[PDB]
Ligand binder design. Structure first.
Ligand SMILES: [Mg+2]
Lengths: 41, 103, 97, 100, 275, 51, 140
């Protein structure tokens, strides 16, 4: 694992570094604004 | 819109190109939080490029103030007294080297 | 013009409060305590929704069947009306069928 | 306690004292350190002789006295950023104040 | 009471801006404000003008005499500006007259003396010194720096430059900053004359040319309140000038100036300054 | 016309087939992109500070 | 109300600052001021098409003015400066009418001499030598 040596130079993982996997969280689509809500779908 | 905003004519300061070209930038004043997430790109500008920028323009004196700020700023002062304070909050290194070379 | 003319009193926040410093302890009590307990026997709340998630029609139907015998009378009549409303909403109305 | 470690000019020599005190054959820069007594003793000398510990993240990486030799001939420099910039040739149109 | 900090913080900083549009502060100089370093800003000064000053000599070209008489009166609870603003005023009063005579070898001694009285007077040179950031590098007693002091200080900078690179650099530094100030100006906007028809007769008698005849070349609307005349100035049936005007005595006075601008080589389509 | 219909029969069939086989190989080569340890560990940088 | 909007003073003031110079109640009341700021912003971008058009008919009207002092017309000047391969546009030609009128007397002379060289060429249709100002400089 070369990836663990990359962890040495990075700062420590806190609860302020966390990020879900890209694709795991979809954006919630809510009816405000010109596109999403006029008759709101 | 142009009726809602002022106007002016095309002018240089002191006939800037006739005899010699005088760089109109006088000062640059960065304020970068050391422990602060918004100044993370601007910390690398002070790291990498603020030495390299300070040798392409010797007539501009640069200050890096490095205090507890929440929104890092660059205060560009010109020879005629106009002050442009632009905010480099959460910008990359690339977006600041274009920001500062534009000022 | 509802915006305050003075800035509000400061929010101090104790990050090393006893609740925050020991937050999370025994969340993993099953997988490294020989499974004698589940992590949902740590959750403390209403007796009907311990270790159980549902929408509002599943929640009021479950609250009625578990705790409706000792609910207050004008508070129970609101629950039967609410179940009768959320039945009609969730089963008869909506965009998708 | 300061982390400023400078590799001395004689690290190749002081190590040959320290392999020989942990053992002793030739090709003394390629001993496999798979014994833990032979790894603890060699690395508890080199910390107490030099003031520079092996980190836990690099501890399993050193299986050869080749690999212990080059951990000690790198320098560790531990300074603040104001110390790092002001000792780094600032041009005279550059002022760095540090309100901290 | 809606909770939250950020709108109350924006609104607090946007009421401070309204406190400055109702109660703005009096001007303080750049020295007693944050981000200032005087030995820095004097080095960076010369690099802007592309000139190699010598910093002991440039630093004292900002120490005025009035600054000194406050420091010693405050010391109860330095070399001046004067030596360097004497070599820098006498040089730029003499290096300017050499350029204006080589470019216009037909202007008299009375006009070029008044051209150099304008380029070295207080109102051009304190527009040059204010946009070259001299006003922020001075040491003086008061603020904003009065044009007695700022016209004095800017020539001590030219005085410092003369002893640091000599005339063959300083004849440029006046050509690039004081000579460029006459660009896009008419002649009698600097050298203001009374009765140009008097000044035109004697210049014409000097070149052994006879009298100019005032004469009405073109006109329009002579019985209205918006007339136009063109008064042509004939010197033996050749015109040397003609000028317009609202009435006849305005157009004859202005055609006298049109003649002097052609006589002196200060016309509008004259050859520009070579830089 | 320079040729007739009998002369241009199949005269571009080698390039016309080859052009579609690049349209077909464009369409049958859809996949999710490679996902790296680079873009994941790079989010640890958001708490980078100075000493 | 769990979370309500505190930033609403600053959203009103992005639209009211653009309406400050208006008349009546469309500078103060946001509901009227948002329909006029929108309509002012629609007119501002559709006037980038009419600034360019209205400049050119102003240039054409100033060229028609000055080419009639010299006897020509606008089409006899502009079409004939093309046949002399002189590719000056309308903005510069209106600038020469006002600010350099000895040159506009030269361009009205060049356009008219080429105009006479076209009548005198197309009378004897067939092989006749071109005028001096009728030769094209071909580029290759
Ligand atoms: Mg609507």
């Amino acid at each position: 694992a070369r990836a663990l040596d990359l962890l040495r130079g990075l700062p420590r993982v806190s609860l302020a570094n966390l990020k879900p996997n890209p694709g795991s969280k979809k954006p919630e689509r809510r009816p405000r604004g010109r596109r999403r809500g006029r008759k709101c779908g | 819109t142009a009726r809602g905003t002022p106007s002016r004519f095309l002018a240089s300061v002191l006939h800037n190109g006739l005899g010699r070209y005088v760089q109109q930038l006088q000062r640059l004043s960065f304020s970068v939080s050391r422990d602060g997430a918004s100044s993370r790109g601007a910390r690398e500008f002070v790291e990498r490029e603020v030495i390299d920028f300070a040798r392409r323009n010797p007539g501009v004196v640069i200050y890096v103030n490095s205090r507890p700020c929440c929104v890092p700023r660059v205060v560009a002062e010109y020879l005629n007294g106009a002050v442009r304070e632009e905010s480099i909050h959460c910008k990359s290194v690339e977006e600041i080297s274009t920001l500062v070379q534009k000022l | 013009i509802g915006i305050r003319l003075t800035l509000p009193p400061p929010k101090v926040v104790d990050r090393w409060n006893e609740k925050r410093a020991m937050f999370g302890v025994y969340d993993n009590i099953g997988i490294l305590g020989n499974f004698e307990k589940h992590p949902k026997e740590l959750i403390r709340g209403p007796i009907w929704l311990r270790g159980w998630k549902g929408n509002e029609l599943q929640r009021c139907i479950r609250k009625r069947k578990m705790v409706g015998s000792r609910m207050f009378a004008d508070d129970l009549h609101n629950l039967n009306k609410r179940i009768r409303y959320l039945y009609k909403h969730f089963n008869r109305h909506g965009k998708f069928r | 306690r300061s982390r400023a470690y400078t590799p001395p000019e004689d690290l190749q020599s002081r190590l040959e004292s320290y392999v020989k005190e942990v053992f002793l054959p030739s090709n003394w820069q390629d001993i496999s350190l798979e014994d833990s007594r032979l790894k603890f003793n060699l690395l508890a000398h080199l910390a107490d002789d030099l003031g520079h510990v092996v980190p836990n993240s690099r501890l399993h990486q050193m299986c050869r006295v080749r690999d212990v030799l080059d951990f000690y001939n790198v320098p560790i420099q531990d300074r603040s950023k104001f110390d790092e910039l002001s000792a780094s040739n600032l041009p005279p149109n550059l002022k760095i104040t540090w309100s901290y | 009471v809606k909770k939250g900090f950020r709108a109350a913080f924006r609104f607090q900083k946007e009421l401070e801006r309204q406190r400055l549009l109702r109660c703005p502060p009096p001007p303080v100089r750049r020295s007693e404000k944050p981000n200032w370093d005087y030995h820095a800003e004097i080095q960076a000064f010369g690099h802007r003008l592309q000139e190699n000053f010598s910093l002991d000599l440039l630093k004292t070209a900002f120490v005025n005499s009035c600054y000194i008489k406050s420091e010693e009166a405050k010391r109860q609870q330095l070399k001046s500006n004067q030596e360097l603003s004497e070599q820098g005023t006498s040089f730029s009063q003499t290096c300017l007259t050499q350029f204006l005579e080589d470019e216009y070898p037909d202007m008299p001694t009375e006009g070029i003396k008044n051209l150099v009285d304008f380029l070295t007077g207080e109102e051009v040179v304190c527009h040059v010194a204010r946009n070259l950031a001299v006003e922020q590098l001075t040491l003086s007693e008061e603020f904003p720096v009065p044009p007695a002091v700022l016209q004095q200080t800017f020539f001590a900078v030219i005085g410092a430059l003369l002893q640091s690179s000599g005339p063959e650099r300083t004849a440029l530094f006046i050509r690039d900053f004081l000579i460029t100030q006459m660009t896009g100006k008419e002649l009698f906007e600097m050298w203001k004359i009374i009765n140009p028809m008097g000044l035109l007769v004697e210049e014409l008698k000097k070149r052994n040319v006879s009298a100019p005849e005032s004469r009405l070349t073109r006109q329009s609307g002579g019985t209205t309140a918006l007339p136009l005349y063109f008064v042509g100035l004939y010197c033996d049936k050749k015109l040397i000038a003609e000028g317009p005007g609202e009435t006849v005595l305005v157009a004859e006075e202005e055609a006298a100036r049109v003649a002097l601008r052609k006589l002196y080589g200060f016309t509008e389509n004259r050859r520009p300054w070579n830089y | 016309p320079y040729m007739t219909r009998e002369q241009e029969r199949g005269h571009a069939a080698v390039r016309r087939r080859e052009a579609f086989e690049a349209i077909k190989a464009a369409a049958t080569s859809k996949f999710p992109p490679h996902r790296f340890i680079a873009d994941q560990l790079d989010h640890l940088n958001v708490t980078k500070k100075w000493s | 109300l769990r979370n309500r909007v505190t930033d609403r003073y600053f959203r009103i003031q992005e639209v009211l600052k653009h309406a400050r110079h208006f008349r009546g109640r469309k500078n103060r009341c946001y509901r009227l001021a948002v329909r006029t700021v929108i309509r002012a912003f629609v007119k501002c971008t559709k006037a980038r098409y009419l600034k360019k058009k209205n400049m050119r008919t102003l240039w054409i009207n100033r060229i028609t003015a000055a080419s009639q002092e010299h006897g020509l017309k606008y089409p006899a000047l502009i079409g004939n400066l093309v046949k002399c391969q002189v590719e000056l546009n309308r903005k510069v030609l209106a600038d020469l009418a006002i600010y350099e009128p000895k040159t506009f007397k030269s361009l009205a002379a060049l356009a008219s001499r080429r105009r006479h060289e076209g009548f005198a060429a197309a009378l004897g249709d067939g092989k006749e030598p071109e005028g001096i100002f009728s030769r094209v400089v071909q580029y290759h």
